[PDB]
DNA sequence: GCGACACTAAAAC
DNA sequence: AGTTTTAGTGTCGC
């Protein structure tokens, strides 16, 4: 009824079928590691502005809620939240050095203002994009919003347990405990150590995330989860690492920039999940029907 | 089969 | 030790 896998940090992922077993909403059994991500491709090379050295990049993503491994399928529920977290790493550059340096895209060099992640959902069979929505903890008593582009600096990905523990923190003392894991406060560095041109000082805000945390995410309520044949549709979640550049022949999305102008989120790397099944609102998807 | 509202159980404090 | 918060899902009404 419950199938258990040991996670990397010694927590468990407990996979169960909600058609057969109902578990409380806030049970720790709702937290579990989702499908592993795979490389789609690498896109634009990035080089350090004097040495010319190519920056090695790797997305480090994980799903921490919302998906169960059931009968060799990865299964989510339309009505329920998923969590997708990601960092990136630069294998050949330590953070402290990285932040003082400057980087160009090799396309013909465009200067990188900052690095960022975005997520997308797709129909895995035809590449059609599927809208995602997020809520705040207040859910219907707060706003709905689409996942945003998240400026980030390189960081190790927190353990599954850490994401769990930080999921609903409001208490100031506990927030302080996790602050260094999730944020870099640029306003607290010694500005004299940095050149005007440094990467750190072209990030758009002083509070810079170390981890992209997309919590309380759902597929848009309009999604059709079955094909006309009544076979399940296959979806996939995508994580894209980009460099944001000033717009003034390679894959990119336009971005609403800080100064107001029409920025450019130039793709660097993309990963995706294997195929995902999503169960809809049908009563037959819930143990209550049995 | 959707948005809204309701109920409820364990986490958070 | 009690009260509030959060989120899976049951239900209503178009």
Curated annotation (Swiss-Prot):
Effect of residue 139 to A: Reduces DNA-binding by 96% and abolishes sporulation
Induction pattern: Induced during prophase I of meiosis. Requires protein kinase IME2 for initial expression and continued transcription during meiotic divisions. Can autoactivate its own synthesis.
Effect of residue 79 to A: Reduces DNA-binding by 95% and abolishes sporulation
Outcome of mutating residue 22 to A: Reduces DNA-binding by 50%
Annotated consequence of substituting residue 281 to A: Reduces DNA-binding by 50% and abolishes sporulation
PTM comment, free text: Phosphorylated by pachytene checkpoint kinase IME2, but also phosphorylated in an IME2-independent manner. Phosphorylation probably eliminates SUM1-mediated repression and is also required for full transcriptional activation activity. Phosphorylation of the DNA-binding domain by IME2 does not alter DNA binding affinity.
Protein name per the record: Meiosis-specific transcription factor NDT80
Organism listed in the record: Saccharomyces cerevisiae (strain ATCC 204508 / S288c)
Lineage start: Eukaryota, Fungi, Dikarya, Ascomycota, Saccharomycotina
Gene symbol of the encoding locus: NDT80
């Amino acid at each position: 009824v419950i199938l258990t896998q040991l996670n990397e940090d010694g927590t468990t992922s407990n996979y169960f079928d909600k058609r057969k077993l109902k578990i409380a909403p806030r049970s720790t059994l709702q937290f579990k590691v989702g499908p592993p991500f795979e490389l789609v491709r690498d896109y634009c090379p990035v080089v350090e502005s004097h040495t010319g050295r190519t920056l090695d990049l790797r997305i480090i993503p994980r799903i921490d809620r919302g998906f169960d491994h059931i009968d060799e399928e990865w299964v989510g529920y339309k009505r329920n939240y998923f969590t997708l977290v990601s960092t990136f790493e630069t294998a050949n550059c330590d953070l402290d050095t990285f932040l003082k340096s400057s980087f160009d895209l090799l396309v013909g060099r465009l200067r990188v203002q900052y690095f960022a992640i975005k997520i997308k959902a797709k129909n895995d069979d035809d590449d059609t994009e599927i809208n995602l929505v997020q809520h705040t903890a207040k859910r219907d008593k707060g706003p709905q919003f689409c996942p945003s582009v998240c400026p980030l600096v390189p960081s190790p990905l927190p353990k599954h347990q850490t994401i769990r523990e930080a999921s609903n923190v409001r208490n100031i003392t506990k927030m302080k405990k996790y602050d260094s894991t999730f944020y870099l406060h640029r306003d607290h560095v010694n500005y004299e150590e940095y050149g005007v041109d440094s990467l750190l000082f072209s990030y758009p805000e002083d509070s810079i995330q170390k981890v992209a945390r997309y919590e309380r995410v759902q597929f848009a309520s309009s999604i059709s989860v079955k094909k006309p044949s009544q076979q399940n549709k296959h979806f996939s979640l995508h994580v894209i690492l980009g460099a944001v550049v000033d717009p003034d022949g390679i894959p990119y999305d336009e971005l609403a920039l800080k100064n107001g102008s029409k920025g450019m989120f130039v793709y660097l790397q993309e990963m995706k999940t294997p195929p995902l099944i999503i169960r809809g609102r049908s009563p037959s998807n819930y143990a209550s029907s049995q």
